[PDB]
């Protein structure tokens, strides 16, 4: 509607936190763990681990598009500027009553069922010179991946190679042309952030990301396993779920982007590894063009 120049900040946003709590509450009401293990500490070093056992009914789990709107007294601003890095002023600004469809997909190292960037692949980082800051990548072309029961996932090799190539090109645009882009697997950590994890059909899938994230400038089948013992993304702790239901478990998702981390440093080479584990970034992917102001 109105047209003014307004400063947008994606890295600090209330919508990200509120959506985070909403999805946490959603997973709290929908998916019930058979056994929940949470840390409890008084600050005296020793920490007693509390265990909560409840019913764990198997339910059908699918993400649904969720539009977000501002109630009376508030309005949501939207940046229509092409290739917006996520921060700073914005020329064309449209005030929207409701945000577009956003699927609450919880996953690491890969963004599924999201939204593609229109004119090209766009990378966004709070601080690019900071190696601790996660880099959000948004593709201009979707890559379909078929994941089936008993863990495996087949996807197009050529499309993924070309994708990694273009992403590498954009990384050469950001970090300079003299640098050589080399992709490597995770440096290690909790099994959730080391491999590619996600929820399909109410079951937790962990697929090996090594084949995808190993690449250099000069029909991929990912082995997958269903883990019934996982680390809760909502809060620090572990949870044990029910055995995987019998029959075919299959989900075909579109990959709209990735989460990457950059190694620290010299000399002439930059290493990029799969990131994620923070779902706030996953919401920030679709929420980067939105902000909340009061009228």
């Amino acid at each position, epitope marked *: 509607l109105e047209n003014v120049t307004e400063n947008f900040n994606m890295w600090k946003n209330n919508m990200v936190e509120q959506m985070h709590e909403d999805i946490i509450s959603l997973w709290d009401q929908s998916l019930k763990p*058979c056994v929940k293990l949470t840390p409890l500490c008084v600050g005296a070093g020793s920490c007693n681990t509390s265990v909560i056992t409840q019913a764990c009914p198997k339910v059908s789990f699918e993400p649904i598009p969720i539009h977000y709107c501002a109630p009376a007294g508030f309005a949501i601003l939207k940046c229509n500027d092409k290739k917006f890095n996520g921060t700073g002023p914005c020329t064309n600004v449209s005030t929207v009553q409701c945000t577009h469809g956003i699927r609450p997909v919880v996953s690491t190292q890969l963004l599924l069922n999201g939204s593609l960037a229109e004119e090209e692949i766009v990378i966004r980082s709070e601080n690019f010179t900071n190696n601790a800051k996660t880099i959000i990548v948004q593709l201009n072309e979707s890559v379909v991946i078929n994941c089936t029961g008993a863990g495996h996932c087949n996807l197009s090799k050529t499309q993924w190679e070309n994708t990694l190539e273009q992403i590498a090109i954009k990384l050469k645009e950001q970090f300079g042309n003299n640098k050589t882009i080399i992709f490597n697997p995770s440096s290690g950590g909790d099994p959730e952030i080391v491999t590619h994890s996600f929820n399909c059909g109410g079951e937790f899938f962990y697929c090996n990301s090594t084949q995808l994230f190993t690449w250099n400038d000069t029909n991929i089948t990912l082995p997958c396993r269903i883990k019934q*013992i996982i680390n809760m993304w909502q809060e620090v702790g572990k949870a*044990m779920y*029910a055995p995987p239901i019998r029959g075919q478990i299959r989900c075909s998702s579109n990959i709209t982007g990735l989460l990457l981390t950059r190694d620290g440093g010299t000399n002439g080479t930059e290493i990029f590894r799969p990131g994620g584990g923070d779902m706030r970034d996953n919401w920030r992917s679709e929420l980067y063009k939105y902000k909340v102001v009061k009228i």
Partner: antibody
Amino acid sequence: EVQLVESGAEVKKPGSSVKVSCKASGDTFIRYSFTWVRQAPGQGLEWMGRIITILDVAHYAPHLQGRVTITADKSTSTVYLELRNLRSDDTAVYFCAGVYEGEADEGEYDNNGFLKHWGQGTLVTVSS
Amino acid sequence: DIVMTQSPATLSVSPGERATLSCRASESVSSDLAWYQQKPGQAPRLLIYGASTRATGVPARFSGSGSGAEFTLTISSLQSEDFAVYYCQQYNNWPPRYTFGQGTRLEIKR
């Protein structure tokens, strides 16, 4: 192969407490879930409770709740059963049992409630 | 509070014949059922689990069947060591509360 060897027979006075042990060997200790089943003489089987080894979590029967505690020592690979406030009706043969849940360290748990393996049994007599 | 009741209490079958045991539940236990065999002075032995599957070490003559609140343990040919006290178990519900049948005594008929 599976090997389960329980503690010797115990004799306690009413009001006291009894603690029996069950030694497990031949396989990985954290990959199994351990259930205790007591059988009164002339009577049938009764489920006391079942403990998950990997998560160190134990569940008990509603009627035995709060007066019984099932624990697991992973270092010595031994499952302990503790019963307090013993009564004359608590006299029975206590069987230590367990079942293979798959690989618990890799996150695979079948959560099986049945019992594949059993122990030799431990006679516990509570009388004055 | 699932109650497992087995029928009959005592079944006398002549050697070389077929034996049929029944196990009923107060409510549907679904696909979760366990048949055990026990001999005097000995610990119970696992026979059937899930009621559709025969355990390792168990002769093929033992066959489980049924669903819901109804179950049947069928033995094609009774051998000398086949006579014992049989039990049924419900592991279905969560948080776990498990119950056993009152037992079915198999007797040699002469």
